[PDB]
Write a protein that binds this ligand. Structure first.
Ligand SMILES: [Ca+2]
Length: 248
C-alpha cells in the first residue's frame, strides 16, 4: 500500500559527473516499473526551495539513474535531494555531497559499530561527533538492504547521530562494502583514514588498505586478529578520551 522509496546518498568529487540513484517500491511486494520520476535539488541548502533538475523513468526493477546536467552541476557542499513519483506524488529523499579532491573521511559499520530497536553503545555518538567536528567526512555503511533504509536512518536520527553519507547493500555484504569503499577511495578520491566496526569488518578494512592502527573494532581482543586491528576493549568513552589526547 504505502510507498517505500529510497534514494542513494551520493558523494562525488568536484568537477566530476554527478549521478543520483533511486529505487521505487510500494509496501518490496510491489515494484514501480516504467514510471516518470522528477528529480529536485535544494541548491540553496537552507532555503527550503526545491529546483526541478529533470526527469527519468524507472526500469523493470524500479530503479532510477539520473545524471545532473553539467550546466547545473553543484559546487562543494551538502544538498538535499528529493525524487517525486509523478503518478502519486510519493517521494524519496537523499543528500548530494560534493567534496574537494582528497577529502578525508571516517567509516563506521552501523550494526557492528553502534549496536550492542537495538540499544546504542555508550559513547558512540560522541565518537562520531568528535570525528566530524575534527574535520572529517562521516561515512556510514551497513550490510542491510536499502529496503530497510526507512528504519535505519530513523534509528540513526533517534540517537542524534551526526549527518553523514549513508550507504546500503543491494548478495555478499562484505564484497559490496569493500568494493563500495574502494570506489570511494579511487573514483571519488576520498582519503579514508579510519574504519570502525565489529570483528567481521576487519577483513573489509584490510581490503581497503587501512592499517591495523586505523582499524577500530568493538569488544575485547581476539587472538587470530591480534596484529590486524585496535580493539576498543574499554568502550567508546575511554576511546574518546584517548582520541582527544591525540592517538591517531
Ligand atoms: Ca540499526
Amino acid at each position: 500500500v504505502t510507498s517505500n522509496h529510497r534514494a542513494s546518498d551520493t558523494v562525488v568529487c568536484e568537477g566530476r559527473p554527478q549521478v543520483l540513484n533511486g529505487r521505487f517500491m510500494y509496501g518490496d511486494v510491489v515494484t514501480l516499473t516504467g514510471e516518470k520520476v522528477d528529480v529536485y535539488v535544494m541548491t540553496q541548502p537552507l532555503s527550503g526551495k526545491w529546483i526541478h533538475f529533470g526527469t527519468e523513468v524507472t526500469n523493470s526493477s524500479g530503479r532510477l539513474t539520473f545524471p545532473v546536467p553539467s550546466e547545473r552541476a553543484l559546487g562543494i557542499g551538502v544538498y538535499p535531494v528529493r525524487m517525486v513519483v509523478r503518478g502519486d506524488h510519493t517521494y524519496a529523499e537523499c543528500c548530494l555531497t560534493v567534496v574537494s579532491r582528497g577529502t578525508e573521511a571516517v567509516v563506521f559499520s552501523i550494526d557492528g559499530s553502534f549496536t550492542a530497536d537495538p540499544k546504542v553503545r555508550a559513547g558512540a555518538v560522541d565518537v562520531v561527533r568528535h570525528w566530524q567536528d575534527s574535520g572529517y567526512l562521516i561515512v556510514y555503511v551497513t550490510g542491510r538492504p536499502d529496503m530497510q533504509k526507512h528504519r535505519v536512518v530513523a534509528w540513526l536520527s533517534q540517537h542524534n547521530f551526526p549527518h553523514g553519507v549513508v550507504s546500503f547493500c543491494d548478495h555478499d555484504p562484505l564484497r559490496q562494502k569493500a568494493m563500495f569503499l574502494q570506489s570511494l577511495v579511487q573514483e571519488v578520491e576520498l582519503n579514508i583514514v579510519a574504519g570502525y566496526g565489529s570483528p567481521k569488518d576487519v577483513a573489509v578494512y584490510a581490503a581497503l588498505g587501512l592499517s591495523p592502527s586505523q582499524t577500530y573494532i568493538v569488544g575485547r581482543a581476539v587472538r587470530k586478529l591480534q596484529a590486524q586491528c585496535q580493539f576498543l576493549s574499554d568502550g567508546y568513552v575511554a576511546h574518546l578520551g584517548q582520541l582527544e589526547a591525540g592517538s591517531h
